[PDB]
Write an enzyme that holds these catalytic residues in place. Structure first.
Site, PDB file in Angstrom:
ATOM      1  N   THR A 152     -41.273  45.505  -0.212  1.00  0.00           N
ATOM      2  CA  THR A 152     -41.872  46.749  -0.672  1.00  0.00           C
ATOM      3  C   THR A 152     -41.188  47.902   0.061  1.00  0.00           C
ATOM      4  O   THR A 152     -40.905  47.803   1.253  1.00  0.00           O
ATOM      5  CB  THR A 152     -43.403  46.750  -0.425  1.00  0.00           C
ATOM      6  OG1 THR A 152     -43.970  47.952  -0.955  1.00  0.00           O
ATOM      7  CG2 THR A 152     -43.717  46.651   1.058  1.00  0.00           C
ATOM      8  N   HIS A 204     -49.920  33.860   9.981  1.00  0.00           N
ATOM      9  CA  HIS A 204     -49.761  33.090  11.205  1.00  0.00           C
ATOM     10  C   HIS A 204     -50.210  31.627  11.076  1.00  0.00           C
ATOM     11  O   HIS A 204     -49.893  30.803  11.933  1.00  0.00           O
ATOM     12  CB  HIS A 204     -50.524  33.788  12.334  1.00  0.00           C
ATOM     13  CG  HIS A 204     -50.285  33.194  13.684  1.00  0.00           C
ATOM     14  ND1 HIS A 204     -49.034  33.149  14.264  1.00  0.00           N
ATOM     15  CD2 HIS A 204     -51.131  32.623  14.572  1.00  0.00           C
ATOM     16  CE1 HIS A 204     -49.123  32.576  15.450  1.00  0.00           C
ATOM     17  NE2 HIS A 204     -50.385  32.246  15.662  1.00  0.00           N
TER      18      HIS A 204
END
Lengths: 233, 233, 233, 116
Positions: A152, A204
C-alpha cells in the site's frame, strides 16, 4: 442546524467494519520499520525513462521496483508468503501481490497475479490497467480476491510513516510512504538524500521478529541497489 | 522483606482497566505519523509574547495553536469529528476537544467546548482554568464527559514519539511530543530546526488511510505556517 | 509442483500461537519510542575493553550496559516492575530480566535472576552462558520461567525501529535496534553520531503515558552517560 | 466573509461597475471606504471622505525603497497609506491608531489570528 447527524450504516458496511475487527482480533499484528534511499531508483528513472517508454510503450514508475523487491523477499522468506488457515499453515508456491488503489468509493486491493513472471514494463501496464478499472468502478470480484501479500502506498498523500493494517487472510503488508530529502551520514560526511520510511505489519503468530526484520531489510537492499536482483546477493 | 507485594485493585480501577480493554478490542486502532517544524510558532511567541500577555492578560502558549489547527482539520475531515454508535455513524456539528491534563491522581481529559468560537487568548485561559482544577482535583464529571477528539501532550516528559490510545468513544487522538533540534534539508542546505513528531491514532473502522494522513498533514501545514488558517489553504 | 502446501500445526505450536493471541487481547499494549547516542558506550568499550577482558576473563559488551540501565529504571518505576494477576497488582521486590536469545528452533527468553546484584562482568558471563545453552538447546524450563521485564535486541538483524510484543505475564518490554550513524544537532552544530532507536511496549492497564515515557527516558540518560548510575541523577 | 469570498465579491462588483450594471442598491451605504490609486502610479495623496461616512483609506503604489532593517539598509516594496477623517468625530489619537493597526496587520497578517 441540529448539533448531531445520525446516519445508519448500510448492511454491507455493517459487516465490513465488523470483519476487520474480527480479523484484527484474530491475529497478532506487530509493525517493524526501516528506511530507504530512493536516489538510485530516481536516477534510473531519469537516465532510462525516455528510452524505457519508447521501447515498452509504458512509463517506468516506482511500483515495478517495489514489486520486484517484494517478490524476491517473498522468495527468501516463504513464511511471509504463507497464510494461517485453521490449524494449518498454507505455503503458496506462486506469487500474487495485492495492490492498494484509491477508488471514488474507498480503497480496494486488486491482485497482481504471478508477478514473478512479469517483466517490469508488464508490471507497470497491469498496475495501470487495474488502477483505471478501480478508478471507474469496473473492478470485478475476481480481480479483488486472493493475494499472498499487500503493498500500500500512502506516500501519495504525504505520509511520513504509519502502521498499515494486514489484509485478511494475508500474513503481512508493506506500507510505502512519502519520499523526503533528509540529511544522512554517508562515508563520514553529511549529504541530503531522498529518504522514504518503510513499514511492515505482520502476524506474529506466523512471522517472528527475525524474519520480519530480514524481509524488510531485503526490500531495502534491493531498492537501494536494484542490481542486487541480478546478482542475487 | 517479602519478595512480592500483592495489592488488590479497587472496584473503580477494576472497571477502568476493564474498559480500555473492552473499548480497545472493540475498535481497529492504527497510528500514522508526521513531523513539524516548530520554529515559526516559537518565533511568533518570541515576537508577540509580551504584547499578547499585556493585551489579553494571559500568556501565549503552544496549545492554542494546536487547538486552532485541530479544529480546522476537524472541519476539513468530518469523519474524524464523528463517532460510531451501534450501527450508526454520529457526525457532530460542533467542536469539543478533550485535553489531557496530568493530575496528582492520574491523567484526565477535561473538555474544551465549542473551541471553534474561542479566540486564542480565550483558549489559553480555558486550558489554564481546567489545568488548575485538574491540579486541585476540582474537576467535575460535567467537565470530563464528552469531546469529539483528544489532544495529549507527552512532550512535557521528553517523549520522542509514541502511539497514543483512543479516548472512548471518540474516533481519533493526536499525540504531541518533545520539540528537539534536528538537522533538516531546507532548499538544498542542511539547517537545524526545532522538530516535533506527531502521532495520530485512529479507528480504522471509521477513518481510512487517506483521511488519517490528510488530517495529520493539515495539522502539520497549519502549525508550520499559522497564516494558512487565515487564507484557508 | 502443487501451487499450495498445507502443513498441519503441531499441538504444541497450536497453543503457542493460541496464547500470544489470548494474552495480546487481554492487555492494552502501546509503544513509546526514543533514541540514544551510543558513542559514549562505544568509547568506553574501546578505551577499557582490553583491560576489562584481562581482569575479568570476559569481553565487555553492550548488554551489561543495557541491563544496568534497565535495573535502575525498574527501581525508579516499580509499576513497570510489576504484573497484573486477576484483580491484583503484584509488585516484585527483586529484579529478574528476561533476555531474548535466538535459538536454531526459534526465539526464547532465558531469565537473568537478581541482575541488580551482579557486576557488569558477571552479567556478561551469565548472558554468554544462557546464550550458549539456548544455542545448543540445553535451556531448561527453570531457565525460561519468570522475569519481571524483557529486553530484546533486533539490531543484530539490522532493525531500525519496531514494536516489540509484551512477554506474558510481564507488563513491558524494551526493544533494542541497530546502531546507525546519523547527523545530529549538537551545541548548534551538526555532527554524525551512532544513534539507536529504543522501543518500549507496555500494558496501558498498568502503566500510563507519563511512566512509560519516564522509564524510557531514564534508560536513554543512563546509556548516554553510564556515570549517572554512580551519581544517581 | 472569508478571503476567497471577498475576492469573489470584489470581482463581481468590479465587473458590474465595468459594464454599468451596478444598481442603486449596490451603491448605497457603507460605513467606510477603501480607494486604490496605486493602480495609476500614485505615490501618496489626500483621499476625500465619501458622504456620509467618517473616514476613507487611500492605498497607493508599491515601490521599492531603501529601508532601515535591524541596523542594515535593505530594499523593501513600500506603500504609503493615507487616512482622511472627519475631525468632528475622530481625534488625532484614534485616526493614527486606526492607521497603525492597518499597517501592523498588513506587515504581518498572522496578527489577525493572534489578535495582537
Amino acid at each position: 442546524a441540529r448539533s448531531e447527524k445520525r446516519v445508519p450504516m448500510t448492511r454491507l458496511r455493517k459487516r465490513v467494519a465488523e470483519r476487520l475487527l474480527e480479523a484484527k482480533n484474530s491475529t497478532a499484528m506487530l509493525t517493524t520499520f526501516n528506511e530507504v534511499n530512493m536516489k538510485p531508483i530516481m536516477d534510473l528513472r531519469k537516465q532510462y525513462g525516455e528510452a524505457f517508454e519508447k521501447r515498452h510503450g509504458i512509463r517506468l514508475g516506482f511500483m515495478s521496483f517495489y514489486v520486484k523487491a517484494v517478490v524476491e523477499a517473498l522468495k527468501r522468506y516463504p513464511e511471509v508468503n504463507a497464510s494461517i488457515d485453521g490449524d494449518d499453515v498454507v505455503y503458496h508456491n506462486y506469487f500474487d501481490v495485492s495492490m492498494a488503489v484509491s477508488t471514488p468509493r474507498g480503497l480496494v486491493t486488486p491482485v497482481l497475479r504471478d508477478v514473478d513472471t512479469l517483466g517490469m514494463a508488464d508490471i507497470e501496464k497491469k498496475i495501470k490497467e487495474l488502477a483505471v478499472k478501480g478508478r471507474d468502478g469496473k473492478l470485478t470480484v475476481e480481480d479483488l480476491t486472493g493475494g499472498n501479500f499487500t503493498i500500500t502506498n500512502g506516500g501519495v498523500f504525504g505520509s511520513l510513516m504509519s502502521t498499515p493494517i494486514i489484509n485478511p487472510p494475508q500474513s503481512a503488508i508493506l506500507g510505502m510512504h512519502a519520499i523526503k530529502d533528509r540529511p544522512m551520514a554517508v562515508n563520514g560526511q553529511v549529504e541530503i538524500l531522498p529518504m522514504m520510511y518503510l513499514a511492515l505489519s505482520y502476524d506474529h503468530r506466523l512471522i517472528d521478529g527475525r524474519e520480519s526484520v530480514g524481509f524488510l531489510v531485503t526490500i531495502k537492499e534491493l531498492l537501494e541497489d536494484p542490481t542486487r536482483l541480478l546478482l542475487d546477493v
